[PDB]
Amino acid sequence: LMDDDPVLFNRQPSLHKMSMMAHRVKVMPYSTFRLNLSVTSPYNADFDG
Amino acid sequence: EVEQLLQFHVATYMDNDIAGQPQALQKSGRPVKAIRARLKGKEGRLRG
Amino acid sequence: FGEMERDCMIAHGAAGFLKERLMEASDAFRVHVCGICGLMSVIANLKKN
Amino acid sequence: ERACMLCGIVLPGRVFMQNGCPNCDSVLNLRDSDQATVNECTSSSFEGLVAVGDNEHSWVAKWLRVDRFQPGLYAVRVDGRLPSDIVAALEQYGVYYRPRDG
Amino acid sequence: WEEPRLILDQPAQHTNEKDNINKRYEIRFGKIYLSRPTMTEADGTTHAMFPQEARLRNLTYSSPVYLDMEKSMFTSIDGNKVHIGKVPIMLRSKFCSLRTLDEVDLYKMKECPYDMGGYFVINGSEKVLIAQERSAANIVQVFKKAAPSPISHVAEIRSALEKGSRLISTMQIKLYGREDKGTGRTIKATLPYVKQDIPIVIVFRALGVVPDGEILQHICYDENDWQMLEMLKPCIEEGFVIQDKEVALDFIGRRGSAALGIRREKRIQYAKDILQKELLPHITQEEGFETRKTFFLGYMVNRLLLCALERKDQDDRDHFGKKRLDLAGPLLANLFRILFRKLTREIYRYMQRCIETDRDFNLNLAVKSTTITSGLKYSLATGNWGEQKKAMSSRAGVSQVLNRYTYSSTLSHLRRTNTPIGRDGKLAKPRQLHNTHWGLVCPAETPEGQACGLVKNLSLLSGISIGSPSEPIINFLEEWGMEPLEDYDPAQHTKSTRIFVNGVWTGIHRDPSML
Amino acid sequence: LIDTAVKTAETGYIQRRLVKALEDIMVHYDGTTRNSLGDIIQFLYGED
Amino acid sequence: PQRLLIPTVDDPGIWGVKVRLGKEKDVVRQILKKKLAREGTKNPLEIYSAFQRDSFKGHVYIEARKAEAINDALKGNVNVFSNNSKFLVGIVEYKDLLRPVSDVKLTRGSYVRVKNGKFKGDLAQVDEVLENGLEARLKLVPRLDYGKDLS
RNA sequence: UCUUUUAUCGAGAGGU
DNA sequence: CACTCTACCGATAAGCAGACGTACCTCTCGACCCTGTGCTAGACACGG
DNA sequence: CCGTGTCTAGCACAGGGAAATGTGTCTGCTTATCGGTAGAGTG
Ligand SMILES: [Mg+2]
Ligand SMILES: [Zn+2]
Ligand SMILES: [Zn+2]
């Protein structure tokens, strides 16, 4: 997997059709995913674990 | 009576929760997984 | 890949992505069937054709 | 437990040695025998245990031909047959042996 | 001593010269012997055990139990300490090798002085008994119904005996007659081992109080209560056809299942021993005392007809004063009773075989001690609390694994209680925090998700009672002047104070303050 | 906390019934909003 | 002749009763003890006989005149099912209940299958039988190690 | 020139 | 030409039984019983 | 008195086969009661 591939991106449980979106890949070190914070509204997500 | 027993086997070969008569147990005392149950349910075939 | 994510990928409309997710990337299989009776009871042999 | 081949009664084997058969011993004399004799006239192998409480009015007893005998446990089927020498001796006594082995 | 002896018997007719010999085989059981835990090596040697090696080698930690036996022979023509199994031992209780010693040796024995004990050890593991919970028994509760039902008010009671602290029977009384619906406003009860809702006048007169002044004398406590008296009329108009005792006795005897053909002669005796035993067993089971039960039923019907006409609120089912916790005592007892019955009956059967060949049963070989050991070790080992062959339909999740992680998530585990109401039916009445939970349980600490409000954690200054006998209290009472029951008369005792003791109603007094 | 523990699963099952009820209604090439076999639900989608 | 002993309407009835499997002989025994113990008393057990056929697992048959006597015979018997399951036998079915018996096979030179031991399941030829008539000498393909791992 | 194994049923404790 | 007296289909409840409990993910702890038959070992008796 | 053989008892392994009685809402479908006639045997 390399830079600029389009991957599907999902959180459970998905409700409205905005909880499954395709992002562009960007390789980074360490062990966690990364999100721009502006996409925390359709996912109903927060970084508290 | 034995023929009725054969009817009972053919019955519990496709249904275990036959309302009306006790569940045919395993050797170790647990209810047998009749075919009717591999399918229905959240964890069967058509959901799982 | 729960039923709800299936509902979402129906909401987007990507039918090819679904046909993929539920075939190649899981469990594909092939069956030789007849055309008169219509059952999966065909006795087949390939290297003898 | 053994079953008398002549009358079909079921008793502990030692009884056949101690007291003889209570129905038959007037002719069989098992009381005064050796174990080989007792074992030739009584069988360790039998089937169909019958409690006969009222010999003389039981139809079951009449069918099994134990209606003239004493109340007790009897066997429907007794395996083996009396030795020919004992059958011959019983016949000398006016007793007719009808085998109970089927 | 719940079942003191065993008795066989042998009548006669044993291939002899008409000589009876009535032979009974009786076995008696006196004295217990408990020894400290001991390891029996595979080599054959035995030596003392301490919990450290009990944990290391994946072992159990139990004590042998010795029980004495004795036999006797009845006739009429016309041995010693038997090892009955092992019992797991709780750490730091008197019967342990750690209640003494003190520090320096506790350090030599590889044990921390900050561990507080309270957990079992099975198969090299640490088990804990979740304080279980049940409802209180031997009181009187009056609940109501919803409205698409022909029943408006119900009085209920579970009856349980004291030596043993175990439940027996369930008895009810139902008030029909919906508010101006259902035609008759009659009262019908329910008994153990019956089929139909038997009326109430029939059980009064069935106990031996055939007139009406005695009945309306027992039920109501005033001669001005013409409202309750106004509701009573259909009960006597319903119980008119029966006028004496025997026809009501057999009126009940015919319904009580039994066989089918125990006519008047034997069936009356059937209904009689039914109305001595099952009905209200926590009161007594000896004859010549049915007056007592009649007084009690009078109080019960009185309370029902005080709740129906709306003079006192319906009972709340969650008032914390009406609940009892079952800790490590009232649990281990029941299982051991069951297993002990099983052992007794196996000894019975082996005795039957070894006596048919006319021999002596050695007692040393007539006991298979693996019953109690395997039963206890199984029930504490898995958690399905009950037996093995009855896997389902038996309670699960009572013995859990200790939660060794931090030092708070352990004290917060040896103090936990669990209510088995379920997970279905949603409802927000057994899950809320009741007003009577002030200082008896914690308000904040509780899990989340499915079991919010169910799992509880006791407060920091709480305590569980043990169980004292009541006869001393009875003496201290009958000193000062508790008037017995039979001298009672409600027109004579319209201002008395009614003294209850453990629920059963034993006497009345007059001036309560000095008492 | 109790009410929060109660209602969410209720709403989830309700949504499963809704979605399993409405999942074959398409917009064919001329404005009709037919189901799986032609029962014109709406003659013109959204009325406009 | 046996044909003169057939049952008639004047003979007692026979009821069958369901009992715990393997406990049929015990129940027959227990009935006899009860009968003999009550003979001549004011409450005799009014049964004539009782029996149990091996071919008929889980049943005892009891001969009497009244059904109540059947209930009396079984009262308190721990091997009997409490459900009111007794059934009536027809007179025309009586003698068949008491049929004493032709497998009795086995001939030298024939094949049999062994049922026990290391040769369990193996085919063997019958070579000969003991004089008394109990054990048979069998010719068997051996399963040997020639002492290879013996100590 | 590859390849290369994770039982089963059930129970409980948890995280969003 | 009033009369009942019964064979109809309504419309009742009426009782009944069963069918049904969010989504995904992590972790730890357990296993058939009883009876009968055969083989081996120990003890007792008999013979040398 | 000692040794050998036979018999009995106990233990282990393998094969075959079950039971003493002891949570709550809804809808539809399968059974009794009710009427109601709606006729015909009747005076
Ligand atoms: Mg979160
Ligand atoms: Zn074809
Ligand atoms: Zn004889």
PDB file of C-alpha atoms in Angstrom, chain C residues 4-43:
ATOM      1  CA  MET C   4     -25.856  -2.359   7.936  1.00  0.00           C
ATOM      2  CA  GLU C   5     -22.664  -1.713   5.964  1.00  0.00           C
ATOM      3  CA  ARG C   6     -24.331  -3.638   3.138  1.00  0.00           C
ATOM      4  CA  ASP C   7     -27.261  -1.228   3.402  1.00  0.00           C
ATOM      5  CA  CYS C   8     -24.843   1.697   3.204  1.00  0.00           C
ATOM      6  CA  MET C   9     -23.016   0.369   0.141  1.00  0.00           C
ATOM      7  CA  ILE C  10     -26.469  -0.010  -1.380  1.00  0.00           C
ATOM      8  CA  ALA C  11     -27.175   3.612  -0.446  1.00  0.00           C
ATOM      9  CA  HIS C  12     -24.083   4.717  -2.372  1.00  0.00           C
ATOM     10  CA  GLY C  13     -24.859   2.430  -5.310  1.00  0.00           C
ATOM     11  CA  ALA C  14     -21.490   0.730  -5.884  1.00  0.00           C
ATOM     12  CA  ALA C  15     -22.836  -2.643  -6.974  1.00  0.00           C
ATOM     13  CA  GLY C  16     -19.474  -3.883  -8.241  1.00  0.00           C
ATOM     14  CA  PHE C  17     -17.790  -3.201  -4.907  1.00  0.00           C
ATOM     15  CA  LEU C  18     -20.498  -5.234  -3.160  1.00  0.00           C
ATOM     16  CA  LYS C  19     -20.293  -8.090  -5.680  1.00  0.00           C
ATOM     17  CA  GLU C  20     -16.568  -8.082  -4.924  1.00  0.00           C
ATOM     18  CA  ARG C  21     -16.757  -7.851  -1.120  1.00  0.00           C
ATOM     19  CA  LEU C  22     -19.139 -10.818  -1.072  1.00  0.00           C
ATOM     20  CA  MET C  23     -17.226 -13.078  -3.510  1.00  0.00           C
ATOM     21  CA  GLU C  24     -13.534 -12.805  -4.399  1.00  0.00           C
ATOM     22  CA  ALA C  25     -12.362 -11.360  -1.068  1.00  0.00           C
ATOM     23  CA  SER C  26     -14.063 -14.182   0.864  1.00  0.00           C
ATOM     24  CA  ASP C  27     -15.340 -17.478  -0.573  1.00  0.00           C
ATOM     25  CA  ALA C  28     -15.795 -18.114  -4.299  1.00  0.00           C
ATOM     26  CA  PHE C  29     -16.886 -21.522  -5.557  1.00  0.00           C
ATOM     27  CA  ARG C  30     -17.910 -23.191  -8.823  1.00  0.00           C
ATOM     28  CA  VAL C  31     -20.759 -25.644  -9.459  1.00  0.00           C
ATOM     29  CA  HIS C  32     -21.680 -27.603 -12.578  1.00  0.00           C
ATOM     30  CA  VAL C  33     -25.471 -27.864 -12.921  1.00  0.00           C
ATOM     31  CA  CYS C  34     -27.767 -29.511 -15.463  1.00  0.00           C
ATOM     32  CA  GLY C  35     -30.362 -27.788 -17.632  1.00  0.00           C
ATOM     33  CA  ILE C  36     -33.342 -30.167 -17.635  1.00  0.00           C
ATOM     34  CA  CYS C  37     -33.660 -31.194 -13.982  1.00  0.00           C
ATOM     35  CA  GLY C  38     -31.931 -28.126 -12.534  1.00  0.00           C
ATOM     36  CA  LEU C  39     -29.956 -29.556  -9.614  1.00  0.00           C
ATOM     37  CA  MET C  40     -26.344 -29.386  -8.425  1.00  0.00           C
ATOM     38  CA  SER C  41     -26.100 -33.179  -8.807  1.00  0.00           C
ATOM     39  CA  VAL C  42     -23.895 -33.281 -11.918  1.00  0.00           C
ATOM     40  CA  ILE C  43     -21.073 -35.838 -11.864  1.00  0.00           C
TER      41      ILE C  43
END
